[PDB]
Design a protein around this ligand. Structure first.
Ligand SMILES: COc1cc2c(cc1OC)=C1N=NC(c3ccc(-c4ccc(O)cc4)cc3)=C1C=2
Length: 263
């Protein structure tokens, strides 16, 4: 079948990311224009809450990464500044975020930069983890490797990354997921960074939940945030225990609006 391999670049999505449309079939894909680690990690990935990798092509200097187009856009744009989003939506997005992170950690992969800009939504608003540019292997041949590299985005990083020389990879991703949950429910980030010099971080450690963003958050999701945003990574709640939390398992959201008629 001729021309099936020809893609037209339609518009800029976010190096640069372009919306690419097939000449013959009109299938939409995201093309990232730029690496060797990012491609190898992306080849390992296959999960319903992780952005799909179709393949890669190199034209001399430029690397073309062919990835899943997510028409719902970024989770970032579903968060209303200083308000957030309805709690049932946040619970559903947090469920899918946990499924994706369980998957990654299960195959020994740490994302290291979880934030709403990197969380994409497909046509049916299914959350997809994206951007494995800062991702690394923390478990190989069933042997854990402690991390020491400084990476991520300061409002989302765990405090051990700023205070300790070495740290376990999994509690760092758990912490950023808790900052994402804060953002979804309050529409604001609690601190610039998790340090004693940060007044907002000190107030949280002093349990001053009468202040923002915490006063906007209901006691059930806030009790979960109290277990995730724990300064000691060894005391911090793990994903298996996040899955047993009362709010995590609280019935809140109805299913997708199904078409129906009466009489
Ligand atoms: C700003 O609006 C959008 C941003 C968007 C999209 C849609 C948007 O609006 C509908 C979109 N779809 N796929 C992407 C997209 C972007 C980046 C990746 C990605 C995945 C793995 C990786 O190693 C590096 C980057 C994978 C997919 C994207 C950015």
């Amino acid at each position: 079948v001729p021309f099936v391999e020809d893609w037209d670049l339609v518009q800029t999505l976010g190096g640069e990311v372009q919306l690419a449309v097939n000449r013959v079939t009109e299938e939409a894909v995201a093309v990232k224009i730029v690496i060797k680690k990012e491609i190898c990690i992306n080849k390992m990935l296959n999960h319903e809450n992780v952005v799909k990798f179709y393949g890669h092509r190199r034209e001399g200097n430029i690397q073309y990464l062919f990835l899943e187009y997510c028409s719902g856009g970024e989770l970032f744009d579903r968060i209303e500044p200083d308000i957030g989003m309805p709690e049932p939506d946040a619970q559903r997005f947090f469920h899918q975020l946990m499924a994706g992170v369980v998957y990654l950690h299960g195959i020994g992969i740490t994302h290291r930069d979880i934030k709403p800009e990197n969380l994409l939504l497909d046509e049916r608003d299914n959350l997809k983890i994206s951007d494995f540019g800062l991702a690394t292997v923390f478990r190989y041949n069933n042997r854990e490797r402690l991390l020491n590299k400084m990476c991520g985005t300061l409002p989302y990083v765990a405090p051990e990354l700023l205070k300790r020389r070495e740290f376990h990879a999994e509690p760092v991703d758990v912490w950023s997921c808790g900052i994402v949950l804060t953002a979804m429910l309050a529409g604001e980030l609690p601190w610039d960074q998790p340090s004693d010099s940060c007044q907002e971080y000190s107030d949280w450690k002093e349990k001053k939940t009468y202040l923002n963003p915490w006063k906007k958050i209901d006691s059930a999701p806030l009790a979960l945030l109290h277990k995730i945003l724990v300064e000691n990574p060894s005391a911090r709640i793990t994903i298996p225990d996040i899955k047993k939390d009362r709010w995590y398992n609280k019935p809140l959201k109805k299913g997708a609006k199904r078409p129906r008629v009466t009489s």
